[model samples]
Target: AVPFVEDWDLVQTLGEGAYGEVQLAVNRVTEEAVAVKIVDMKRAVDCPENIKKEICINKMLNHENVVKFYGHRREGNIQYLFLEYCSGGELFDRIEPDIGMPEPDAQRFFHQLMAGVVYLHGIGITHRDIKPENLLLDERDNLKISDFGLATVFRYNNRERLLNKMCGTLPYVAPELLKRREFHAEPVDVWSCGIVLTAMLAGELPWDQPSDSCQEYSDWKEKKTYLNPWKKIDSAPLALLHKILVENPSARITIPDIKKDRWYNKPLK
Candidate 1:
């Protein structure tokens, strides 16, 4: 009959990593549930600021496609941050290894991802990592941007800024980020969206990496649809992906451009 510490009932632990563990908790009064990331200061001594950064970014985001951030608390050396608990699992889990989702299904989630990106960019936050695993689903099966560990504020006072740090997964990272040059933060996320879009439709990455060393990437450069997934993808969507995954950061499609594209304007199915 006792609550787990205060007025909430604890559920099961979701998962754990080097940083900490996450627990499911239900509020006794409202019965609303949340995922509480539990970080012990002793174990997190090396990167406590990273914890704060995630919390801060989550606190600033407000969108249905974004995993909601409730608040946080600290008990002695243990810190806890409350987040929206998504029951629908990772977007990565939905794809069939060789086939992927149906056309409209892929379109649907891609739309949702772009919408979340739109909101995040509007508020100046660059996700930095926008792979399928980082994209989650809620109880309603709606896509939610769940992770905030790699996010950073890229705009200040309505002016955009270049980001120096190269952060994100190999296959999903933008070529510009891998180039070690100072890069605009917005395009980085868009490039990742291209990878996610392709994965949703083709069920595999375009390449192991985006460098000249990667033969698949070199093939993609020869012709956008020369790759396997691109060959498998439909014309309209394939065209969009081509524009999004452009190697030149300046030439790549922006969120606004994607918004204006006729293909992206298609109805969600």
Candidate 2:
């Protein structure tokens, strides 16, 4: 029997996939609700270093749009992390395949997404993984950035560090990861956010992944054109998507640049 006890009691299993098992729990005393994710130390992907790295990063962040990490516990090869329960579930859940959410809603949520990202970069942290799946929604439908297992710190006191490790999921992944070259961390995140905005606005990914192998990406590389989903995105947001998803990191829009873009700054009612 695994013998590590937590202050909270598990109510029910929320979801389970591969080695990640999540559950709903309540504090025995205060009845505070939390989501507990079980990490399998035995899994090659869930190595101790990544777990420790995530914990360290999560501990330092204090943002309204970032998921709240309560604490963690360990027992043998089992690790349990308690996090804020985003009752509204994943942003992925709200996505409607070929038809996405409304415009004002996407605008509002995309603004929130960038706000959270700006805060992360401001603190010298870069969320290597940012996608609809990792983006959860609270009861108010506000976006909460989650899952720091693939994230890393790229900045310290003053000097910035370029990252070599390949991280983040496909479709939402940046060109830096696809090119296999050492790249600046912040721009990679900007590219991913651009992908997310496309998905939110169009209800599907621009392509399976950004690579020459993917015809959609190839066409974009050959000519400044996007695939089916982009066909659905209007010129306003589409213009911003083009700026953010530029091939060269130098040309890619930064968080500040996005804040000033006409589409981003467009007043919503």
Candidate 3:
């Protein structure tokens, strides 16, 4: 028999999304606090395959940097996903326009983010969406990657390749993906990581576009021809950022290269 909502007591609503709302719940018997994502089955029917794939992908992931999925139950027209409660809320909540994270904190989170991404790629998975809103923080401020509806399996046996699907948040989407170019998944992820790193440090997006189409990006590009973004960043780290934020996907920095860079290799102080 499938479990029903009546078995748990709803504490409060955590968040609301296109699928449905997530609420804090406590088991009547065990009294364990958990997050229950109540998804509207009727609304989800239009994209059943994506939801099912998300479930499958999430179930396969078991890393400390990834959100822990407890179990799921379906009843009537609703689907309930029990998950580990992230009391610290989202990484997005911490980002502010004027009060961005300290360099050390940002570097720590970036390291964890890279560790999670490298793990996912090693396991043949590609998370198509990697943004602040999808990164939750545990009580200890550890990052937990969530939201797998856009994720896809990238490797089969020994063959690995490119993905043509265009999906992800606008600000963080790779330049190649936005240009309708078929691109390798790993490079796209790296580009997004660069954007994430910049957002963490500056509390704002680096540019409206990686290309010179947007007025802001064009200004930034022109300035870079003679000067860098901010005089605050030191030369080595500034050079590292330029390497990672390359508009050309083929020229963008790779995970291994990032690990070797002086900025990334330096121990967080």
Candidate 4:
């Protein structure tokens, strides 16, 4: 276990969750800023298996779009994962114009995101939580996928079905998951990626119909069949998006399939 430095100057807290607290700390040697995610021992003890899984996954992921895990240190019962700090901030920050970015920029980010996720799935890892918050940006505006706590490895044919657990944020979750059926991890992740793409481009979701009724879930399912009319959005290129978010896991789009998209080609070139 590495000993914790007492005199290191601590900066503003970045985020906090069940994992404990994340703060920006300066590297005493190089004087460079780094993001440190600290996990409390008591809570981590409750889910030792899950925490171990996250550690293994982070160590395995080696890609430009993936956040680099510098080191994992333990002091007493507390654990810390030190990572590269991105000055450009989170991808969700770009949604507001105050961030000084536009649609075309967002498109580029999404295109790069597809490339990143493709690499992840190629190795059989599923990033279950893929909201904008998990997408971090660097000083150059290049986004890095972070927060792999919800990520799980999908061993092919390890089980009779794909993914059995119904987990992840509802708004970004694929509709097929509501059925509580075993679904393909790749396609389900793609569906969320598609939603993120739509949000990035349109500044809103594809078919986020309003519903405060008891049948809200049912209403949401029906609305999924069509795009919003008020946004002047037609269903032209949306077919790719639908292919991923389809209620049927078998019909959903795969990571490689999304790479073949013409829209991805434009920004990729």
Candidate 5:
């Protein structure tokens, strides 16, 4: 398929990344506004594996909350990915030093994000990078999972039965991922979800325990027990977190379990 052209008309710069800038521009044929992610093909060619993966993976996957990869382009040495525009803005705009929402508002948004992750997992894709910055929202505050730059499908082999790359934000990263052992994509994704839950609930990370340390993270991976920072969390959130953060991959909660959780039954918390 042909990509959105970079014409001489006024093009608004939407965002910038390692590859290039994203522009909000007019679709010549459709006349609709679209987000055009233009990557420097010269720079992209250096990382052949990742370039190929992004093209293949992003084009193949389709889910409600996940951003859509419309098409690719080769404008001289500049490669481009035409994607559906996220009208709302990035998740960081919703939280941080300012603009953070109330508890109930956060719960509703968090539930929507979990639903997105559940959909991605069902399609056999694991977003290795799951953080606030990667989440986008529309005008109505509808959440959409964006940035498949580090995502991949879960595959197994004789020596290893899952992706072994150590990638993601440090605080939100799963313990098993930090340990770099044989690990499944689902549980690690869940672990990040648990961290996100804490952020949504308390407006910060919950790894502030007295004994929390690098060793504690490793210990948390090996041992099932956790010294939760929240002292009096209700049983619903507590139970859901445990099922997601299990050290044993097989014991970790499945996507169905997350959807079935009582906490999600009535929003986030």
Candidate 6:
């Protein structure tokens, strides 16, 4: 049976979002610290499926780049998920406008992010939402991918498949997801990775959208032209960015392509 809230000594609230509240707590039995995500059953009753889906998918994941899940508990109208307490905070807190992360550091984090995404794809899972807010940092400053509420499987009978779900934040969402009725799962993740890499380099969103209609995106469409922090980067990285950020999903680079890219293969400090 799931334990009650009283079983653990509540520390402080970690964060609160539209989904529910997350709090830091210590288990009385083991005296171990953990982050407990408390979801209001009444509010989530409308889409309880999302909560169930998150729990089910997360339980199956076991990767160094992925956040570790301890267990879950339910009592009355609340559901609690015990997760590893990341001493460091959200990855979003690190990037700042006009003060992008150092190239080598950003490369390391992006590499870790891609490793997690690659693992998820290998297991037929697709994380629909891939953003800085969903990426956490541990005490050792390692990147940990979290938040699988919008994740879904994209394989059946050992064959790749497409998914139709207009979900994910606007800035990081793939153009194909917004423009098409359905889209391949892996490419969408690759697109979002481009956005994340750009943000880590430029310290801001490249544009409101990935289409040529957006002036900011137009500048980004040109590989040679650098913007702000990106001006410090060499052509090799920019060239790789162009391959991943293409508006046409068919032309966009895949994870395997990313691994083979010269810039990505360059030694990191």
Q: Which candidate is the best by TM-score?
A: 2
- Over the stretch 193-264, how does candidate 5's per-residue lDDT look in tens digits? 777765655555645331236554445444434444433345566567667766566777877778888777
Prediction RMSDs, each to the true structure: 2.8, 3.7, 3.2, 4.5, 4.8, 3.0
Q: Give the clashing pairs for model 2.
A: none
The CA lDDT at 111 in model 4 is 73
Clashing residue pairs, backbone N/CA/C < 3 A, model 1: none
lDDT of each: 0.85, 0.84, 0.79, 0.70, 0.69, 0.83
Score every model by TM-score: 0.91, 0.91, 0.88, 0.81, 0.79, 0.90
Candidate 3 — which residues are off by over 4 angstroms? 1-6, 41-48, 220-236
The Cα error of candidate 3 at residue 33, in Å, is 2.6
Show pairs that collide, candidate 4.
none
Across 121-197, the per-residue lDDT of candidate 6 in tens digits comes to 98999998899889999998899999998888898679878878688888898888877998899999998888888
Models sorted by lDDT, best on top: 1, 2, 6, 3, 4, 5
**How many collisions between residues are there in candidate 2?**
0
The TM-score of predicted model 5 comes to 0.79
Q: State candidate 6's TM-score.
A: 0.90
lDDT (10s digit) by residue, model 1, range 163-195: 988788999999988786698999999999999
lDDT of 6 at 135: 92
TM-score leaderboard ranking: 2, 1, 6, 3, 4, 5
Query: Where does the lowest 10-residue lDDT sum fall in candidate 6?
Result: 40-49
lDDT of 3 by residue, 1-269 (tens): 44554578998999987978989999776777888888754335536546667688878898999888888887876888878789989888887774567778877888899889998998988888898888888889999898887888778796886788788887788888877557888888887787788777767776666665776566654555243344444556666778887777788888888888887777773
lDDT of 5: 0.69
Error of 2 at 127 (Å): 1.0
